[PDB]
Amino acid sequence: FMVSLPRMVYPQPKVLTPCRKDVLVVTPWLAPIVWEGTFNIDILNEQFRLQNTTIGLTVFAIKKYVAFLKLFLETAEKHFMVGHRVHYYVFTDQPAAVPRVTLGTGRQLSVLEVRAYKRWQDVSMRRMEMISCERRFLSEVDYLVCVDVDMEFRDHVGVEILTPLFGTLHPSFYGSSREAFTYERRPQSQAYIPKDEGDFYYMGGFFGGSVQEVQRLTRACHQAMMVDQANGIEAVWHDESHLNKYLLRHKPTKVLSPEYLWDQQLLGWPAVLRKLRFTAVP
Amino acid sequence: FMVSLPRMVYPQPKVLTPCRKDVLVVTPWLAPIVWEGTFNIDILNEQFRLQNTTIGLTVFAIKKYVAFLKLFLETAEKHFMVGHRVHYYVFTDQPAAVPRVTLGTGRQLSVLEVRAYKRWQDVSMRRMEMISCERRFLSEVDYLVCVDVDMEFRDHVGVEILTPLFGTLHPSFYGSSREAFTYERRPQSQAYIPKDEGDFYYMGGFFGGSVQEVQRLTRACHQAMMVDQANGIEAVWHDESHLNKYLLRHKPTKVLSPEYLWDQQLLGWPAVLRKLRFTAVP
Numbered sequence: 095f096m097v098s099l100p101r102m103v104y105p106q107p108k109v110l111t112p113c114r115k116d117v118l119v120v121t122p123w124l125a126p127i128v129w130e131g132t133f134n135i136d137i138l139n140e141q142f143r144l145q146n147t148t149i150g151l152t153v154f155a156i157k158k159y160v161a162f163l164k165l166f167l168e169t170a171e172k173h174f175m176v177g178h179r180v181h182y183y184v185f186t187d188q189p190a191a192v193p194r195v196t197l198g199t200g201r202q203l204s205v206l207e208v209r210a211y212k213r214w215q216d217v218s219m220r221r222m223e224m225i226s227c228e229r230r231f232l233s234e235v236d237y238l239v240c241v242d243v244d245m246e247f248r249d250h251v252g253v254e255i256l257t258p259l260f261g262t263l264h265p266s267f268y269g270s271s272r273e274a275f276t277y278e279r280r281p282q283s284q285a286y287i288p289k290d291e292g293d294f295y296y297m298g299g300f301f302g303g304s305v306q307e308v309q310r311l312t313r314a315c316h317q318a319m320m321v322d323q324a325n326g327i328e329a330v331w332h333d334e335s336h337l338n339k340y341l342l343r344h345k346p347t348k349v350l351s352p353e354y355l356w357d358q359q360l361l362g363w364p365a366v367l368r369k370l371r372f373t374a375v376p
Numbered sequence: 377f378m379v380s381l382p383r384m385v386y387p388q389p390k391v392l393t394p395c396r397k398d399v400l401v402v403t404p405w406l407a408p409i410v411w412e413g414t415f416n417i418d419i420l421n422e423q424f425r426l427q428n429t430t431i432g433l434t435v436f437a438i439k440k441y442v443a444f445l446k447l448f449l450e451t452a453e454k455h456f457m458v459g460h461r462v463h464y465y466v467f468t469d470q471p472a473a474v475p476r477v478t479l480g481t482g483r484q485l486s487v488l489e490v491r492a493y494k495r496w497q498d499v500s501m502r503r504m505e506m507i508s509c510e511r512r513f514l515s516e517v518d519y520l521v522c523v524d525v526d527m528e529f530r531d532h533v534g535v536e537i538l539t540p541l542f543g544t545l546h547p548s549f550y551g552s553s554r555e556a557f558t559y560e561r562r563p564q565s566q567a568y569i570p571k572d573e574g575d576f577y578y579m580g581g582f583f584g585g586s587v588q589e590v591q592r593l594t595r596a597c598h599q600a601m602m603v604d605q606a607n608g609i610e611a612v613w614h615d616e617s618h619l620n621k622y623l624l625r626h627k628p629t630k631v632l633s634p635e636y637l638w639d640q641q642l643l644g645w646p647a648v649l650r651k652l653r654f655t656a657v658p
């Protein structure tokens with residue numbers, strides 16, 4: 095039951111003036127592509143607060159990556175779903191290395207101890223298995239957001255992202271034609287996508303959705319990875335290749351612009367990006 | 377469980393070329409606004425067929441309005457959800473006057489006999505009550521679409537419209553500022569909207585959604601109309617005023633452009649409309 099909004103005073107949307115004329119703001123399957131200027135966060139905040147929405151955020155910090163948690167969490171506190179209920183799930187082989195970061199009201203952190211794998215490829219790839227865990231998220235949160243830890247928030251990341259299923263435009267490929275995408279190209283892999291298929295190249299470092307849709311996606315990608323293993327093939331970009339195959343065949347209901355996953359050292363600050371919200375740490 | 381799409385070959389969406397630059401294609405609460413050029417119907421058709429989607433279409437044909445049914449249904453057959461399962465629900469005081477129109481496969485028509493009210497205002501207004509009926513739609517269709525009968529389809533009206541809750545931009549007001557909207561302005565009415573509120577002016581002749589959301593909307597508008605009656609006030613534009621109050625406070629998840637409800641005699645064929653899909657019959 096969606097509760098009625100209260101009276102609100104805000105600028106009228108005008109149908110004969112687009113917000114943004116410089117970028118695609120809706121996919122061909124009618125999913126919004128989230129850019130600054132496309133959303134009124136006051137409206138969205140109302141809608142999601144009236145539902146008492148809880149967002150879970152998953153992050154893996156294995157081996158030396160535990161060093162990135164302090165900045166990741168400190169800046170999450172400043173920028174990520176502020177005002178909403180948040181549950182951080184920190185998966186680590188080193189529980190005692192998790193920094194004690196002061197949280198705002200309505201926000202909590204759980205440390206989930208996991209095995210470290212030796213190869214950084216397996217650490218990255220096994221996130222899907224670990225995320226898929228399963229009864230816990232279903233009882234505790236409405237949405238799950240799944241990110242890389244070697245990152246910092248610099249600007250607003252809020253309920254505008256929430257939807258049944260989302261992926262994020264990889265910042266190196268948003269302007270590329272599809273044959274340039276680094277999809278897995280060997281037919282022997284479950285992640286295979288031919289040169290004439292593909293909508294976008296999604297980044298493995300930022301995806302999410304409802305708990306149900308996230309469990310579906312992580313289960314399907316883990317199954318597909320196990321099939322590849324049994325067959326002696328490792329996809330070119332590991333979990334990210336499978337994520338891309340999944341999202342090709344199960345279209346996301348929102349797509350995040352590269353505002354939401356950017357690398358300023360590698361790519362600068364183009365005029366098309368009005369905000370750099372979540373960025374790579376050198 | 378959303379089933380996997382098959383391989384498909386279609387044009388790549390390019391994030392640095394918008395489809396449409398001339399019109400707003402997404403609302404500030406991240407609802408798509410459906411214009412020609414924003415959707416790939418082949419993708420949407422796949423998505424909805426894999427769900428075996430059934431669409432119900434409600435139409436009232438009371439008193440002399442039964443004359444409009446032949447053209448309405450004949451042209452629906454040519455343009456409305458072709459290839460999908462369709463159930464037409466024709467509400468009439470004259471069952472024997474319903475024309476025998478030949479339907480495509482997978483499509484059916486039921487005639488629901490109702491009382492005629494004397495005043496065209498009450499005939500229009502009581503649609504909400506009649507639509508809200510209730511167990512029947514829940515068992516028989518996935519979505520309900522609710523339209524005026526004095527209309528004809530001229531072009532494609534398909535699954536691009538389907539969503540939990542939609543309204544349609546009134547063709548006389550899409551370019552107007554909000555204080556020009558003919559919302560009910562008396563505070564004594566449940567339909568009241570102040571001059572500094574409002575996103576759009578939605579047309580009472582074309583709305584829809586999931587069966588659940590449509591039942592919510594029609595129930596809320598009927599309750600609000602009964603309150604107004606008890607209080608001796610009739611809103612300026614009857615059901616349409618209440619519809620507008622509802623959609624202000626419960627935002628639609630898609631908005632249809634005026635392609636979907638147009639009057640060529642009154643308003644011509646502006647360049648912003650690439651297609652005139654469902655049009656007023658003189």
Ligand SMILES: O=c1ccn([C@@H]2O[C@H](COP(=O)(O)OP(=O)(O)O)[C@@H](O)[C@H]2O)c(=O)[nH]1
Pocket residue numbers: 153154155156157158159214217218241242243244299
């Ligand atoms: O030794 C490792 C390697 C990977 N990761 C996790 O896997 C993510 C993906 O790896 P990485 O950020 O190195 O990949 P990149 O962004 O360079 O593609 C990291 O953010 C961590 O969250 C980890 O915790 N420890």
Ligand SMILES: O=c1ccn([C@@H]2O[C@H](COP(=O)(O)OP(=O)(O)O)[C@@H](O)[C@H]2O)c(=O)[nH]1
Pocket residue numbers: 435436437438439440441496499500523524525526581
């Ligand atoms: O005597 C009447 C008056 C109204 N209607 C139904 O109510 C709708 C709304 O009325 P109308 O189309 O006259 O309103 P308008 O489009 O002129 O605002 C009509 O399409 C019919 O579906 C009807 O069936 N018989």
Ligand SMILES: OC[C@H]1O[C@@H](O)[C@H](O)[C@@H](O)[C@H]1O
Pocket residue numbers: 264266276297298331334
């Ligand atoms: O081509 C795909 C790759 O692009 C790189 O820029 C990124 O650092 C990698 O993790 C991978 O996503």
Ligand SMILES: OC[C@H]1O[C@@H](O)[C@H](O)[C@@H](O)[C@H]1O
Pocket residue numbers: 546548558579580613616
């Ligand atoms: O101002 C609202 C009105 O606009 C007219 O153009 C239309 O014929 C009416 O039914 C009503 O919608």
Ligand SMILES: [Mn+2]
Pocket residue numbers: 242243244299
């Ligand atoms: Mn990373």
Ligand SMILES: [Mn+2]
Pocket residue numbers: 524525526581
């Ligand atoms: Mn009409």
